[PDB]
Amino acid sequence: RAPAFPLSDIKAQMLFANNIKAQQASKRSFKEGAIETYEGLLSVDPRFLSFKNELSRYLTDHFPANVDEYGRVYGNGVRTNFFGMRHMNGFPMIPATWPLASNLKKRADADLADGPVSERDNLLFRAAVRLMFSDLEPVPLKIRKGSSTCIPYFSNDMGTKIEIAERALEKAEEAGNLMLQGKFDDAYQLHQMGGAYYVVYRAQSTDAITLDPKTGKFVSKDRMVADFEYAVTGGEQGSLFAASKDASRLKEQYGIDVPDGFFCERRRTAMGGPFALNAPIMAVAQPVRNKIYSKYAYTFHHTTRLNKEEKVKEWSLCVATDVSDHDTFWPGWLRDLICDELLNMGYAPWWVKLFETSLKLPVYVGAPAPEQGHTLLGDPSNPDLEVGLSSGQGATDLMGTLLMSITYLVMQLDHTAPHLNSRIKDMPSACRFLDSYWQGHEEIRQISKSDDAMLGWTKGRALVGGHRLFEMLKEGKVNPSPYMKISYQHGGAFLGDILLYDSRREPGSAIFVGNINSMLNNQFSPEYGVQSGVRDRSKRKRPFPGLAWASMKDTYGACPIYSDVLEAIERCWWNAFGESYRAYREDMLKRDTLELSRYVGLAELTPIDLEVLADPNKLQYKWTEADVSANIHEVLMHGVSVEKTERFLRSVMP
Numbered sequence: 001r002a003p004a005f006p007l008s009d010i011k012a013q014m015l016f017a018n019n020i021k022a023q024q025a026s027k028r029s030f031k032e033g034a035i036e037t038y039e040g041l042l043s044v045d046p047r048f049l050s051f052k053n054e055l056s057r058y059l060t061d062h063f064p065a066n067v068d069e070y071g072r073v074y075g076n077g078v079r080t081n082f083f084g085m086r087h088m089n090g091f092p093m094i095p096a097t098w099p100l101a102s103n104l105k106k107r108a109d110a111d112l113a114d115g116p117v118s119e120r121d122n123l124l125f126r127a128a129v130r131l132m133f134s135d136l137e138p139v140p141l142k143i144r145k146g147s148s149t150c151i152p153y154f155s156n157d158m159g160t161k162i163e164i165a166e167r168a169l170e171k172a173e174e175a176g177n178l179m180l181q182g183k184f185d186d187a188y189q190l191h192q193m194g195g196a197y198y199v200v201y202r203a204q205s206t207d208a209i210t211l212d213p214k215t216g217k218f219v220s221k222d223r224m225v226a227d228f229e230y231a232v233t234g235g236e237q238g239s240l241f242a243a244s245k246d247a248s249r250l251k252e253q254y255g256i257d258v259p260d261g262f263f264c265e266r267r268r269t270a271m272g273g274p275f276a277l278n279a280p281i282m283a284v285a286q287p288v289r290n291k292i293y294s295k296y297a298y299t300f301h302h303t304t305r306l307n308k309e310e311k312v313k314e315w316s317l318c319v320a321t322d323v324s325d326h327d328t329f330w331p332g333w334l335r336d337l338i339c340d341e342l343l344n345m346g347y348a349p350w351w352v353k354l355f356e357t358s359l360k361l362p363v364y365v366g367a368p369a370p371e372q373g374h375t376l377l378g379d380p381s382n383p384d385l386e387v388g389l390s391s392g393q394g395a396t397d398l399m400g401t402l403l404m405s406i407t408y409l410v411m412q413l414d415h416t417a418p419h420l421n422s423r424i425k426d427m428p429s430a431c432r433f434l435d436s437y438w439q440g441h442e443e444i445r446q447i448s449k450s451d452d453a454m455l456g457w458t459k460g461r462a463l464v465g466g467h468r469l470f471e472m473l474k475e476g477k478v479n480p481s482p483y484m485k486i487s488y489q490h491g492g493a494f495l496g497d498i499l500l501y502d503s504r505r506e507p508g509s510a511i512f513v514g515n516i517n518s519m520l521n522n523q524f525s526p527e528y529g530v531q532s533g534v535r536d537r538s539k540r541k542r543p544f545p546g547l548a549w550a551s552m553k554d555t556y557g558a559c560p561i562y563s564d565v566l567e568a569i570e571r572c573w574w575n576a577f578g579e580s581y582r583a584y585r586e587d588m589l590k591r592d593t594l595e596l597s598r599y600v601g602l603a604e605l606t607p608i609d610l611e612v613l614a615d616p617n618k619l620q621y622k623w624t625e626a627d628v629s630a631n632i633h634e635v636l637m638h639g640v641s642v643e644k645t646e647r648f649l650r651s652v653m654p
């Protein structure tokens with residue numbers, strides 16, 4: 001049972017430096033409220049809400065999901081209903097979950113191993129660690145603009161961040177060594193490395209909604225959560241119940257109009273790391289990305305839909321997988337294994353302790369619901385939580401791939417390719433086979449970014465077993481992996497793009513198109529608002545919203561129903577607004593096109609560049625620095641001197 005501490009306690013007090021921003025953060029209470037969907041327009045505006053009500057009914061009606069029995073998609077490309085938009089963007093379900101403080105039991109109760117099952121697996125994992133963290137080229141420590149440093153200073157002034165980051169890369173060794181001696185408080189008080197994660201709550205504005213033919217009433221997807229007790233005890237006591245998306249309280253409290261079939265939005269937990277501890281970790285994680293997005297680009301680097309469609313055309317079978325709640329599930333033991341191999345490889349113990357510790361840190365829960373929260377979970381003096389993986393750890397994306405890639409590969413050997421076992425006899429042979437399999441220069445294949453992936457089998461012996469596996473995944477009775485809960489994706493798609501099979505449901509005559517539902521989400525149910533209160537747009541969550549219209553075609557036009565939907569959209573946006581959506585959007589576009597230039601027409605920019613500028617969160621799951629124009633990059637990022645990261649990195653590696 002995890003130690004808990006009220007905001008009042010000395011232990012949580014020193015999470016928050018002596019200034020307003022920081023103190024405000026320790027204290028900050030629940031906050032709901034309509035979002036400025038677009039400039040001058042509220043998410044709960046009676047017209048906008050009526051627009052949604054009709055657009056979703058009509059679209060789900062005239063274009064029902066065309067999805068296979070094996071979760072392959074065909075026909076119109078619609079993988080589901082359009083009811084997503086039926087949320088009161090800004091008003092959150094209540095309560096949000098308390099971050100679970102130990103997944104040890106969660107994993108057990110799920111039948112997932114507490115470590116590698118077989119020495120083979122133990123080799124493949126360690127191989128991944130080797131191939132990932134070896135032969136690294138130093139780069140600048142690129143700092144995202146606008147981002148917070150969280151515990152302890154809670155600043156978001158680039159100048160301050162640069163200084164902290166540089167300072168960190170200096171005294172990072174001193175601190176790691178201090179952690180090795182077990183003096184974590186000493187390390188934190190001297191270098192603000194340790195302490196805790198800061199538990200914000202992100203919105204996810206497009207969770208599931210269904211329309212019961214029986215009921216005729218709408219049905220929000222149930223989303224379970226943990227009351228404090230459940231979370232501190234990893235599931236022993238406490239209860240795990242569903243939160244209320246019921247949006248009526250919206251009327252009572254704020255007098256707002258609540259149409260039939262609208263709900264509050266799902267809220268996922270998000271963590272914010274002590275920047276001073278992420279700095280030394282990012283200086284390494286970024287190079288690692290570089291090595292893999294190049295050398296092992298077949299399985300890891302994903303840009304354009306051709307780039308995807310190409311690799312898959314060659315496959316004889318394609319299986320889109322899916323991972324349940326990947327993050328709260330991430331094995332604690334993989335961290336310890338990854339940390340061992342690093343040590344073995346010769347990585348400097350101190351830097352591994354920073355890494356080890358960054359994955360065992362207490363989390364500070366802010367505001368799950370009104371009158372809940374303001375609590376530190378676990379003791380910063382001796383960090384030992386098993387949160388799983390934390391959204392804001394320096395290497396969090398790599399941590400998902402390292403795990404999940406091997407997990408899949410194993411799943412392939414396990415059910416399709418036993419004859420490759422001979423190939424993995426020892427460490428060296430392991431890498432060799434891994435280094436092979438990761439380039440896709442092998443008969444079983446994989447493209448993946450952490451929890452999203454598609455698995456492929458070329459012609460060959462495995463090919464038959466592959467099909468067996470597909471079947472095991474359809475019946476969904478047996479879990480194929482011992483490491484994570486894995487299933488097929490009902491409506492197969494990879495990194496935002498839908499795989500559109502055809503008449504012959506074969507990966508050859510398949511083609512990647514974009515998800516049309518995603519467009520409707522981006523355009524009408526935005527994560528954040530326009531932030532007019534914020535002056536510098538590069539500091540805003542959506543800097544140049546208009547710009548997305550420019551890349552609409554270059555992105556969604558590939559969809560079977562793209563045209564119709566643009567016409568449906570335009571139509572309904574008339575019945576509700578009198579105006580013309582196309583005009584409204586073109587009006588936004590022209591505006592921000594001028595505005596943009598003070599921060600650097602669009603002749604130059606790429607189709608991506610725009611999507612990024614309209615929402616830079618797509619650097620956080622979709623694309624990468626290499627994918628964006630180097631001059632557009634400096635608008636959303638600023639780095640730390642390369643001299644400084646190079647010297648640092650030189651002390652870390654072997």
Ligand SMILES: [Mn+2]
Nearest residue numbers: 320453489493
């Ligand atoms: Mn998928």
